Subunit: 498 residues, 4 copies
């Protein structure tokens, strides 16, 4: 029997585990330490969650090590590993409303969006990677023969072993799922650190691994701080790979910690300041819809959000006019209400950062067309914001807001290379977009954009089969697609002479 926080909400009964998950059981942290998790809709405490300590990290890693080296997970067929992951996806689907409701409470995710994305994409991710298990293949290689003898060379794709996953708060279940699904499909075991502010779907997911029959110790979950729990994971001599998602500055630190301990493998999914270039020959009404989505999707708490819009001179004023018209139509409110399409920011400190961000934009001389403030209601709601007359040297032209702030610059009619130069003038390189009906412009621009993803006449169109990762200081390694598996596999070369 597991202890739950129980809550009647959204036409169901939530049963939320709140403890650490280690070796297939929910357990208190050392000293029974706890912290409060906060509902961004009203600022209330949802419940108390165990606060993992260093000794809890060591217990989690030891359980993962034992599960990998001696448990059933390391013994079963890849096909049967696949079956278990497909079953886990099924169990997640059976609990989809509950999961999406927890995400609405914990992260401020609009419930209808959470059902399709936060939860829906997580389910797709597990099903996708479950199909990879028995299709992960090595090679046989035609090497030079040591005549008069013969040689056979093959490669074997093997698991890396114990992995650590450290993730942010914007899509709590989805960020966990991207990495966890690829990690488990490759045959590894894992210790996961959700962002401290958003532990609840991670702990519910943990319970679901029990319902699915995932062997004890394969999945371990440690609500807690990066500076304590995350650090220890990065430092641990039995951890062999870290999958990290978060800010560029913490990514640098994580990579350093991997180096100094045991040169554990690392992937880094970091910040972005993604440019969206909108040409005059696009479909304008569609550009407004997609451009708004590129910024405002999930209250802007979206790594790939367009952090800069470049709009061709001749359509700029009309584009801005239409955006403002549509922004006024947005329904801001409780993420559980069906008419809501703009939920609260994830937590109070982030709301404060956004308010300060827009003050700097005003101070430095950008035109605040609308928004810029907290919405005067309970919780941590921020107004959908539009800036114009943004110049390349401005702070808001350079810094990632990670909020619902559309930051608009002009470019001269007929310019192409000039705007590309401006769009590429960043140490980030996560995503980018271009709206145009012109085939030649679209292909040329996608060639020249210095970013890991280029959207053409769309935005936010991610897919579990399509690899996702950045260039430059947005990091390296992929989530999603076949490419993601490579972060969680090692290649052993075997060479015979006969």
């Amino acid at each position: 029997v597991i202890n739950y926080v129980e809550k009647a909400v959204n036409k169901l009964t939530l049963q939320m585990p709140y403890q650490l998950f280690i070796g297939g059981e929910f357990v208190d942290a050392e000293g029974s330490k706890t912290y409060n998790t906060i509902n961004p809709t009203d600022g209330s405490v949802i419940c108390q969650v165990s606060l993992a300590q260093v000794s809890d990290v060591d217990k989690a890693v030891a359980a993962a090590k034992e599960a990998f080296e001696n448990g059933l997970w390391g013994k079963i067929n890849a096909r049967d590993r696949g079956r278990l992951l497909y079953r886990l996806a099924d169990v997640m689907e059976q609990h989809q409303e509950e999961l999406a409701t927890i995400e609405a409470l914990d992260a401020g995710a609009v419930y209808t969006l959470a059902l399709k994305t936060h939860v829906g994409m997580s389910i797709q991710t597990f099903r996708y990677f479950a199909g990879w298990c028995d299709k992960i293949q090595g090679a046989t290689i035609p090497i030079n023969q040591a005549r008069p003898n013969r040689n056979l060379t093959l490669t074997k794709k093997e698991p890396v072993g114990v992995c650590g996953i450290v993730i942010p708060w914007n899509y709590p279940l989805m960020m966990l799922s991207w990495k966890t699904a690829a990690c488990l499909a490759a045959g590894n075991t894992v210790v996961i650190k959700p962002a401290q502010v958003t532990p609840l779907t991670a702990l519910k997911f943990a319970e679901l691994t029990l319902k699915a029959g995932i062997p004890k110790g394969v999945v371990n979950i440690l609500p807690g701080s990066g500076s304590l729990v995350g650090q220890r994971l990065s430092d641990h001599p039995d951890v062999r790979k870290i999958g990290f998602t978060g800010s560029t500055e913490v990514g640098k630190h994580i990579m350093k910690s991997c180096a100094l301990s045991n040169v554990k493998k690392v992937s880094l999914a970091l910040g972005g300041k993604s440019p969206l270039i909108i040409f005059a020959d696009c479909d304008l009404n569609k550009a407004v819809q997609m451009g708004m989505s590129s910024v405002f999707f999930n209250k802007g708490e979206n790594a790939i959000a367009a952090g800069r819009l470049f709009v061709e001179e001749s359509i700029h004023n009309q584009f801005v006019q239409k955006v403002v018209e549509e922004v006024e139509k947005m329904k801001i409110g409780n993420p559980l209400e069906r008419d809501t399409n703009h939920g609260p920011q994830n937590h109070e400190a982030h709301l404060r950062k956004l308010v300060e961000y827009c003050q700097r934009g005003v101070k430095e001389g950008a035109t605040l067309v609308c928004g810029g403030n907290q919405v005067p209601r309970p919780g941590f709601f921020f107004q959908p914001t539009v800036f114009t007359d943004v110049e390349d040297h401005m702070y808001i032209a350079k810094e990632e807001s990670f909020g619902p702030i559309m930051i608009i610059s002009r470019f001269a009619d007929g310019d192409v290379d000039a705007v590309l130069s401006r769009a590429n003038a960043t140490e980030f390189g996560l995503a980018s977009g271009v709206f145009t009906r012109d085939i030649n412009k679209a292909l040329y621009v996608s060639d020249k954009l210095q970013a890991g993803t280029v959207f053409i006449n769309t935005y936010n169109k991610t897919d579990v089969a399509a690899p996702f990762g950045g260039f430059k200081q947005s990091g390296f390694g992929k989530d999603l697609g076949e490419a993601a598996l490579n972060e969680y596999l090692r290649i052993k070369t075997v060479t015979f002479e006969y």
Copy 2:
């Protein structure tokens, strides 16, 4: 007109550049600083070589950046890039006797071996990777469709950009070639730091890039110290990838430096303590020949060298007797003499370490069967060495010698899992081997060995098509084969809606 150090040796007239190679020209370092490169056969100075300074690194990176962004290398077809690399291999082959002679002088490489391996494999490396240029392919991916609209998702494989390569001294030209060929095949430009003690084949290679018509700035070479030149390469804001080969401890520092600057990508080819397990049912005479090769090849200056031999009890004494017999037949001498089997160690500091290594092995109680000493002759020669009665707790059971020291332990008749545990009880995981006629043992042992390469009834059988890289603290990433290309490529995902 290039300045050479001219030398008449080995029935050739060597013409050796000695300056920095920056932007397609040989130039002096800042302040015309130089250092001496030492011939390990007699301890004499070969010549003075330019000593790169920080401002020289900045010039080399600037030249590489220009070559990539604006030069011809970034504009030509993949097919034509391949043609240039195949021409480069042809030029290397035209100069093969000269290159092997330089390697004999600089590194102490036995000339006949340098023709086949140090230089021979370097030529094969460029030809192999030349073939990859127009065969590097992205993907088209069947993503979910945004109905009633359609989506197309593709990936493009692109160059990473400016790379730094930092290498050691054991196979100076070949270590350079592995990384350089894959790096250039993928369309990058490069700044190479050879090991300070072995700059000469790198500088001759530089001149050969001119003969082959590699555009200026594509290849740049900076003899100098790791703590100065290598450090700056790892720190540089315009460098996007470091390919590193060296010790585990420097690898840790390199990775930290990549992290702290601009999270540049990194590959780490580090140290080894590779186990070779020899069962009683092997071919004994072959096991002796291959066992000796596993240790003594290239005077033991071989990262994959077997650093422990485990020999089954019933054949142990006969194995040792036969090795001693064969060791006594080895001809130690000038690497340029055709009858030489065993050349000098690479440099004096390394010889000193090997002497100390064997002193400690005797101190801690291992049986010194033969060798262990500097050979009484000029230069830095070390006697092929055999230790027996080695126990798992001993320093020589744990520490990488990187010299010609065969380190032998017994295991009990029939004790497969037990010997495997002993073989795996190391934080290294570079290579390994097993000698047995039994198919079931061979396959089971190769599954269980925790190493990036497993040799079965052979050793030292590397091939330009077979990926090479370690596990655990032997690093990550691959040199050679198709896999090596992934270190020098980035994947861009392009998603259309239409």
Copy 3:
């Protein structure tokens, strides 16, 4: 309401459809023509089954064409096609006992075996290929650029369209499933012709596609003759691909019919005379168990069955003695008896062929050690048979029996090339095997055997992930694994200039 033949048997009430399945409906054939399907355990008529006519073939192809061109199957996401195929596998699993019982009745498959293989592997097949749907990918290719313009070249993997599948009677559901799963996973629609003698699991399968929600017309099944139904399929102008499994001689005719009509694509999975080479250094008792299995599995009605055993001279007589001892322990009887090891042959005409085959073997001078005749009891049971003193010129050394007849020749110790020559002296090339503890022999022999599959120290180890197909007159193309998809996909190259 679907009409069923109802039967109380094996603790179940079987509900067996018996009509043609066209466009999602069970329908009588033209003129309500029918034929009898026979139970091989007692020779009784199970029921009457609709007998497809030419107009019925045209209706099925029209339904398949409409389903492909305009129906839902052609419009849904690859991922969603995958979901439907997974659901089909789940439905088959929910009905596995019923399917295995039907296969016992219709094909004489031993019930316990049919659960694991005839049905269990069919289920694995659908689940395996379900996972491929959203992982079928094309390429982007670095072609030469038409300067000063640019080029993008990509490939798209597309379905071939309407396919015809024609199969034999030995594993009715499994042969169906292998091809159908790959065919549908690739996005095609299909008309299936089961062997006339074994229509029943195919028709139950058809009903399961309805339960699974496979869109109407995607799957169509036409019990009937090869010379009428199969012929029309191969001739039909709207069929673009035939997947054929059967005899070499019918395969020749089928390929010709494809040629003469519309050059439709064809795969050919044909006969075998597979050699198993057993060396004196094998584990003898294991060689006996696996050698017996290589021949007697599924009453010899197994295309990959070892059709000759070459047994090394020094172990031959002991091998034969052990085989005879084990053959005598085999329980022959009703496929529903849970201790049955050997069921009846599939149908009466095959039994008669096997009696004649053995008369011919004795006549030409082979030694009949045991078996060779019909078991005196109702139905069509044939004794497990062993021949020795078989020589290379003999009819039974050349001709495929497709029955439980072990055909043994000696070979001399210390020649390997000589036994290979004898093993390779056939126009078949489907499978082969080698039993030896010697790694060098195993690897060399596997290199030299001229067969699409080589088993080493095992036999009949097929797997849904491992491609299966023959060489020479055993045909071409693969069932199973990733390679099977290529028979059901076409590649479109798309080249842009911009």
Copy 4:
């Protein structure tokens, strides 16, 4: 010493072999039979060429078989096979002017074009496939384990063995090179049948294999008739694969012959009636240039030639006007004159077909705008032809001309699906094209076109890396790219239990 036909022409002294090439030597055919090859510029006899007989085919196949089974080609490293093919390309490059001159004489190929395409692309083809030799790789596959035992499954890519190549006359050297390069790269040996009318570059190529060091019997060349030599190749019991390029009707017969003998593998590169759709929103001047090229390139003797142009109503009249203007500027003349841009048709029988084709076009009611006739001069020149008012029911809307005949229909402004339906209403499916600046339209049309290749805003943009093959009655299998190798390889699955 080889017998040559010597010819002083194009400022060169041509040395043309004229005999059969069998087992590394030029020999007369059985009975010294010969036939005349005809210069299409003036209708004169170039020289007498040996006429291969059945016994000569048997000798070639025996030589290919011995070279494969016992000769050096079957023994050398894949890497060394690649070196030989690169060397072959180099020799071809050293002879490029001579080869292009021979092609001008034999096939009427315009010299400047033959240099770039006929010969230039043949060279690229051998270099490209030379690079594949040591990069052809099999797999290791994660199959279900027969617990308590373990299984390893791998695939080996092997050569198919002796191949027959049967080709047409439009690009004699290039068609040979496409197939021969892939065939040899995969490790096979080959007997080549050039079109009887164009044997000369094939025989010169044969001599170049000698210069390049290709082992005797690896390449064998038999000038002669399809009905005799081609037939025997398709019939031969030792040939295991036919690579065929030619008409759809001969393709059907070839496939039938493959079936009836030994089910040898076959690829079919057959005819085309490829549609080019030109929208009003294209760049009109570029559409005219590329539209011209799509029809007139290599005097229309181009399998992928656009056989229908569909031009949008609003630009149709202007397109036709501009085409007529450009057609009038074409210089018809001797292929060796530098100002010629339209050479003679390949041979007399083809010229006659083209005359009849245009007669039937006029008869059935199409508007003949220009050409349609043999040019009044010696040889077999044909006037570049333009037809308009072509309706879907007409012969020239359905039948492949394989000549310089532009066949134009209108489609209504704003129609897309309607014109696609018309473009797809053919049993051919080789190539196609679309000209439009609209990204949505270009992507949609490329999805919907039922053809193996789709060109977007270009035409005739083939590449050695880009796979090329048809759908429907245009055949199956690819030439060029990685995909081409699959036709010349077989996959062996090796499964161990241990």
